[PDB]
Structures are given as C-alpha cells and as structure tokens.
Symmetry: C5
Subunit: 206 residues, 5 copies
Amino acid sequence: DRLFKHLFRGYNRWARPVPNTSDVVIVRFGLSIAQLIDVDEKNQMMTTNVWLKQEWSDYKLRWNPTDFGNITSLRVPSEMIWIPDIVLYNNADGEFAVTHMTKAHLFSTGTVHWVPPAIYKSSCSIDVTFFPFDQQNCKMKFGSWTYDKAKIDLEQMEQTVDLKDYWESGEWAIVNATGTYNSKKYDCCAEIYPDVTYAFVIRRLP
Amino acid sequence: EDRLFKHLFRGYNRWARPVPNTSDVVIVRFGLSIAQLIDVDEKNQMMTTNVWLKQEWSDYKLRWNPTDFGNITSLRVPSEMIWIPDIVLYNNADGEFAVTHMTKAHLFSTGTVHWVPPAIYKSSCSIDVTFFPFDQQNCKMKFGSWTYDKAKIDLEQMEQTVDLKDYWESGEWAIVNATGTYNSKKYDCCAEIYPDVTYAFVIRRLP
Amino acid sequence: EDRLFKHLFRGYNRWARPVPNTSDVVIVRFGLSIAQLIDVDEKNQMMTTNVWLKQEWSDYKLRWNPTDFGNITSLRVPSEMIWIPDIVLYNNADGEFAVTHMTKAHLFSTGTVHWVPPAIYKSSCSIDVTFDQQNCKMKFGSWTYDKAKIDLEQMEQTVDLKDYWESGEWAIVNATGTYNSKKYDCCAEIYPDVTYAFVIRRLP
Amino acid sequence: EDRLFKHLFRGYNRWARPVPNTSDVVIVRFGLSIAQLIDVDEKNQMMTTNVWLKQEWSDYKLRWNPTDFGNITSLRVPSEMIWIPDIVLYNNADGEFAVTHMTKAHLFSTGTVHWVPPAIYKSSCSIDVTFFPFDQQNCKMKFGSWTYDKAKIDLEQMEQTVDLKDYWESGEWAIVNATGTYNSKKYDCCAEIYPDVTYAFVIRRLP
Amino acid sequence: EDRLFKHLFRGYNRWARPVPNTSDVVIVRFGLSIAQLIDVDEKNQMMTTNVWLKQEWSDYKLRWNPTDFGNITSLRVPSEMIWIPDIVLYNNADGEFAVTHMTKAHLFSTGTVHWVPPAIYKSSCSIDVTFFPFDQQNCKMKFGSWTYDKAKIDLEQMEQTVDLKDYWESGEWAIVNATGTYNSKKYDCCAEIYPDVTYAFVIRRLP
Ligand SMILES: Clc1ccc([C@H]2C[C@@H]3CC[C@H]2N3)cn1
Ligand SMILES: Clc1ccc([C@H]2C[C@@H]3CC[C@H]2N3)cn1
Ligand SMILES: Clc1ccc([C@H]2C[C@@H]3CC[C@H]2N3)cn1
Ligand SMILES: Clc1ccc([C@H]2C[C@@H]3CC[C@H]2N3)cn1
Ligand SMILES: Clc1ccc([C@H]2C[C@@H]3CC[C@H]2N3)cn1
C-alpha cells in the first residue's frame, strides 16, 4: 500500500541533517533553459525561465520494493525531504532559491530527482561589437549557500543533458553556453565553497 | 446525520501525497475558461490573462454512498486537503507557475472531483511588431503535470465543455479564436514521458 | 465558562470546512462600501479601488446563551477560525481575487456573523475618456458554492455604499449594484453574483 | 526561576484571541512617529511614508513579579504570541494596510506592553485649493482599530511630546505641521462607534 | 553515527525567543559584504542592493562536546530553529525590513553561530542627479536591532578586513567607496538606547 511506504520513510526523519552516514554529499547539477524571457539593457539585466536539475543520494530514503506493493518509485513533496540549499549567487533581483516548489522523484534506491522550475532575474554584461548584431555575456552563478566542499560538493551535470534542450526561441540567441566548476574561500567564512557558473552568449537577432 | 460526520470518514484514512489510485493511471479532463485578456505588452514580451483551469479527475479513496450521509450527494472540500494534480504553466510564470488561490473542490459521492480555480497568468509570447493597427499574434499557453508522467497521469481535453469563450469580458483586445491541442514528449532531463496541453490564441485590437 | 471557556466552547468541535447550517442554503447579506478610488488607468484601461466588503450571514453552531457568559453580549473572533464565504471578484483581480487581510469577525450569540474585510482591488473597465465615459464594473460572488448551497441578498445600496467616499481626480457620479444568477458552461449548477456598476466622469 | 522557564509561565494559559482585560475597554496608547518621507509622486497624489506605530497597553493576563525570577524582569517576546490591537490604516496602504512585519514587543513585569513596529505606508492626499500654495500639500493618515469599537477598545493619543520627527531624517522634501487628532464616528455600515486618530501633515517643496 | 543524536537534545530543550545569555549583553559581530549594486532610482526614489549580512554571536545553550562527534563538529542548522537577531534596515523604502530568506546558520560546538543570509534591499538614500554623468550621491544604509537595546544586545562592527567589496560585480555602474560607522542613540519613543551601524556609500556613474 502506497501510504504504507510513506509512513515507513517519513516516520523517522529529520530533513534538517545532511543525508548520509558521514561526509560527503554529492549533487548532480544541471541547468535546463526553457526560455529566455526578456533582457532589457536600460535595466542591463536578463530574465530567464529555467529548470534546475538536481539529483543526489539519500540513504535514509532507501527501501525494498518486494516488501510492500512492489513500488520502485513514488512522488513525494520536496518539503518533506532534505534538499540542497542552492542559491543563485548572481544577484537575483527577486529571489535566490527555487520557490515554487514541486515534488521530488524518489527511487527505492535512495536516489532523488528534483527538477523545479524557476524565473530568474540576473544581471548581465554587454559586448559592443556591432549595433544590431551586438553582444552580451550574461553569467548565472549557482551554488550551495551554506554547505561547503567538505559538506556538499556538486558534480556538474555533464552538459550532455542539454543546457539548451527545450529552449524555445524568443527574440535573442544564447549561442555559446558554458557550465564551469569553480571553488573559492570567500573572504568572510573559513570554508571553501564549490559553484557552477554559467556563461551565455546573446546576440541581438534581427 | 451531519455533513461533519462525512468529512471525518472521508479525511480520516486519506493521504494527499499518493495519487488517488487503486493500481495505475489517473485521467484528467482538462479545460480552459477565459475571463480576461488583461494586458499584452511588447516591452516585456508577455501576455496577461485571467483564466479558469477546469480540472476533473476521479478520486478512488473519496467515494461514499449518499444514503449514509443524506439526500445530498456532494460537498465542497478544501483543495489543500485532497490530492490535486501538479499542473504548471510551462512558459514563464511572472505571476506564478501553479494556480495560487486556491479555491474549494466540488466533490461528488461518485468520487468525481471538479476543481476550477481562478488564475492570473503571465505567459511568454513573441509580441508582434509595429505593422499598423492590424498586427496579430499566436501567444501560446503550455500546461502539463510537472512531476507525474503519462504512466502516472494523463490529460484528456475537455470537449471544451468548460466553455473557452462564453464568459469573457473584453476590455482590452482580441482573442478571436483560441485553439487547444494535446501533445506528448520526452525531455532530456527525465526518462519518462510527459503529456502537455498548450493553448493557442489570436489577437486583434479594435480597428 | 470564564471569558475563555466560550472561545473553547464553540471552537472545540467546530469545522471551518462545512457550510454552517442544519439543512440547506446559507444566505449572505452583501454590500460594497467604497473608501477610495485610487486610480483609473487610461492606457491600461482599468480602475483601482479600496473597498470594504460587507458580509453578513448566520452560522448556527456559533450560538450561545450570554447568561452563561458575562453579560457582555457577543465578541470578536479571528476570521481564519470560522467558516467564511469564498466570495471572489470574478472580474479581473490583477492583484487579488479575494480579501487577503484578514481582519476579525464580530460574532453575536445569536449565531450571526458580521465580517467586513478591507480590500484593494484592481478592476477592468471598457471604453475610456475622450467624451468621456467609462464602464468599470465590479463582479462579486461565491466561487465554489452555487445558489443551492449559498445565495446573496444585497444589503440595500440604500445603506449608502458611498458614506466614506473621499473624491480624488475622478468622479463616481452614479454607481448601482444589481443581483444576477447564471449557469456557466464549465459547471452544471447555478451561481448568483452581485455586480456593482460605476460611472466616473473625471468631472472638472 | 529559569529564563526560558518564565515564558512557560505566561504563555501556557494564554489565548491571543481574547481581549486582555476580564472587564471592559482596552486602552491602547497610540502615537505616530515618522522616520522618513520616502517618496512624493503628484500624479497619483499619494505619499509614501516610513512610519513607526507606537503602541503601549496593559495586559491583565501578563503580570509577574521580578523578585521571583533572576536576571531578572522585563524582557522582549514575539508579537504573534499575544493579543495585539488590530490598528489599521483607514486611509490607503497599497503595500501593507497594517504593520505586516511584524516585530517583537517589549513586555514589562507590570503587565504593560510596548509594541513599536515599522511600516511602509502609501497614502492619499490633497493640494487643496489655489490660495494654499500650489507646490505645498496637506496629507492625512487615518489610523484606528478595525473590528473593535470604543467600548471594547479605545485609543488615547500619545502627545506630540514623543516627537514624530526625532527620528525624522530631513529628507529631500520638507514636512512642516504635525498634528494628530482623535475622532470618533458612527459608520453607516456598522452599529457601533469606532475611534480613530487621524494625522494631518503639511509638506512644502523648497528643494 | 547520528547527527540526530546531536540535533536532538540541542534543539530539544530550546526556546528560540529568549536571548541566549546567562549574564547580559549578547554581542553580535555584524558585517556587510556587497555582491551587487542592482539599481539606483531614479529620479524616483531609491537605491537597490544585493547584500550578505554577516552575523556572529554566541548561544551558550548551543554548546556540546565534540568527542560525542567525530572530530570537527559544527553542523548547519535552520535559522528558524534558533534565536537570531532582529536586525532590520531602518530606512527601507518600498522594499523589505529584515532578512526574508532565510538560510541556515553555522553552529559551532563552541556555541558560536555564523549566519550570513543574502538580502535584496531597496533603500533611499536621496534622489541624487542634478548633473550630467558626473553627478555623485550619498546613499546610507542603517542597520540595527529593532527591539533590543544596548543593555540587552549590542553590535561590534566586523573588521572591514573581511571583505565588503571582493565579490563586487560590475553590473551597471559605480559604488566606488563604502564606510561603516557605529552609532548609539536615545529615541523619544523608547526609554533605552539603541545602537546601530550605518553604512555610507558613494557611486559614480561608471565611465
Ligand atoms: Cl552559514 C553560511 C555559509 C556560507 C556562507 C557564504 C560563504 C559562501 C559564499 C556565500 C555563502 N556561501 C554564508 N553563510
Ligand atoms: Cl469548484 C468550482 C465551482 C464553480 C466554479 C465556477 C462556476 C461558477 C462561476 C465561476 C465559478 N463559479 C469554479 N469552481
Ligand atoms: Cl520530479 C520532476 C520530474 C519531471 C520533470 C519534468 C517533466 C516535465 C517536463 C519538464 C519537467 N516537467 C520535472 N520534475
Ligand atoms: Cl467585524 C468588523 C467590525 C467593524 C468594522 C468597521 C468599523 C470601523 C470602520 C470600518 C471598519 N472599522 C469592520 N469589521
Ligand atoms: Cl519593542 C521596540 C522598542 C524600541 C523600538 C525602537 C527603538 C529604536 C529606534 C526604532 C526602534 N529601534 C522599536 N520597538
């Protein structure tokens, strides 16, 4: 019975503690871009509609399908489980994390697939090459806000799962798109925090 | 003797989390009503609408026989209390992705759920040109469940029985004929297959 | 009961979910009060009002005998605790469909509720200025409960909707509310509403 | 005599719902402080103020004797836990309408509460007629309990002794007259009589 | 092998409400880092910033002995679960008071917390312009406890050694000099004395 598996896993659990026997949590992270909504220059910023692909392992979420119902995978609330606190470093002008939220896809293996939608407003830069065919770099910097490389580290979801895959063409381009792993000590706080920053290229399309 | 006796018996056992199923596949008759064309602006590249998402599905866990309640066969229950579909607006949401009100569902003793919340959607579009007073536009709205694939959930388009156009106050521009069509796809992000229904519009002004 | 036993006496068994009666048909007395016309937008063709939603109905379960309590009559309770009507603004609330405040209700031992939430609505109009007329109607109603379950009788617009009206840049010369009943093609039942129609001449 | 232990003593038997007296007529000491004049836009004739609503009242239910505790007394608790005045802005308020924050209150062993939450108010006003200067303006703010009448709740105005302007940073455009004044009315909606304090401001533009 | 062995029992005995001190005066090391200067309006009427409020204080009740943990014992806890300072932006505008996110705190066996939530503040300052590209502006940001005075809580300004500007993103323009300065005052509203740290900025339209 479906309710039988939920109470089994949710019954004891703290979403608060990091999900493993001991260090460290690895998160597969990839950006999908559904639409580049608008970028105005007067504003000097870009508006995007994206999907934040995240998959990680929660051992405390493991179960045996043979035991009840032969249920390999169920869809549970992301509010119920532990999720990584991933923020958009790059100066969201409304909101930093994914606020919708949406359900997570949990597999009997303890593997979580979360893909919430987001509308981000993020600051960009502008190349001057031509008047109409002129260009812009528009970076997007995602990373965990509170967990450092010791506690959480992200493996970049491998640009094979396409940055551009469902992108519906609006007005502008986004020609070269790059994910890049980085790591730093930030001058505030003792630990070193991984990020994946994205570089986009948008050419004014006539 | 009292409806409150039926609230208990229905809610008592229930989990909102699992799809209200027996073994496999929830089906939603899905239909759009349009109250308003609020704004269409070029600057921002979007369209603003006030729509009604009519939804209908059957909840197995929620069936009862009216004789056990009274000569009345339906009560209105909170949409936060029951399982409802995770349907989202794919193309932007500068208001919101899901329906945010959210109103009650009208539950029928047969187990049939009708949920029809109001919504104001801000949805992306490619907005015309100058091209004289006469410039028209497609402006699509793309709906589908976000986490549940076709195995788990599927959408069948209402006969357009929830009327697309009967209650529509004009006030802004056009909506001449607006067309829905079912689709289905795989996305590189998820192994499963997800149905959507996108709705297409046509816009005029008042020349 | 000690002044709190009465909260406890009624709040204890009660459900906010169920329409509050013994049989059928909750009747809600409804009136629109207008405090201010904030703005009427020309380009974007619509009007913004700050209103008071007068609501009155009878909740059976909330009845008591005051003798059993202080002699203090009736009290003010939180609106989230009781059943309140889901009256929504049909008509383009582009900020907000319903009353989002939510202020308290004045509940009487008699089982009578008086709820008057303030609300700020952004509402659609039709053909503006140059002569200069405007439609600017506001359509109110229960969203999920049809006439069978809940129905509205107008606090007469005889009790003036306009007493509190402070005039900004526009008019509101004649504004009249009128009751309707309709079937919508989405839904099999019949749903009553009260539309209030305004006319504003920006009058010099 | 444990500091978190004292909380346990006041909060345990309490309802935020009921007026804190056991008799009649809560008196809330009320005064407006103006920290900043944020913006003045003439088109929509409204004013944006950053204000502090000074409120202090007595909770019968909140007294304790410091001798019985050790750090010892008069500490700050969350404003959500107690009963507080439903004081609202009659005038306009398109962002807040009420305090909507909300801050902590400072509770005194004597049972008296000081709540002083910040607000961003957007409020309407008039330029009046031509012999009032054309670039100067009168701007009123009407504050009061929304659901409680003078019998159940009443306001006594803090004198202009506690300065509206002490925290008033002299901004871009000026403020001259500051007078708050108590009123009471019967409203055609509602049988009772509801006290208010209206504040009337004057603002001249010498740049 | 369980943080819940550790999570539990730390939070278990806890009240978020009372200031976490056996004596008096919890000291918060308080500091700003600037990620981006989003915008300056406008004309009308304000400045927009993307900030990190670096905060550190000591909650003794959050102490545990690390030996009951493997070696380096500090875990990340919900800021919702602990006591956190009520620091607000005094001036604000059409934006928001306090930290509205809000992210996790870094708790040390020492009882020492590191909380550094991101923030988007909209605050004027003063309208500026009047000149051509060469107009300059002084935009201040005043942070401080709202309800807690210096007797109960006080601020030590974090060294500007730990960087204010390192992550300063070019964006649109300016923000060439910043200064933090500690103040303490009596307000005619409130009998005690409330300390603040105000920041003064200078932003030259980037050439
Ligand atoms: Cl509790 C905590 C952890 C980390 C941080 C900061 C350090 C890195 C850079 C910004 C954010 N992440 C701030 N607070
Ligand atoms: Cl559950 C439900 C019932 C009815 C409806 C709609 C039909 C009537 C008019 C609009 C709204 N009310 C929408 N949802
Ligand atoms: Cl948990 C989860 C599963 C699947 C999805 C995806 C399937 C459809 C198309 C994109 C998004 N919605 C997103 N999240
Ligand atoms: Cl429950 C209730 C009672 C009274 C009121 C009204 C009385 C004063 C004036 C408007 C509003 N405040 C509104 N709601
Ligand atoms: Cl409960 C309370 C006490 C005092 C205060 C005020 C004193 C200083 C200046 C504004 C605010 N901080 C605000 N609230």
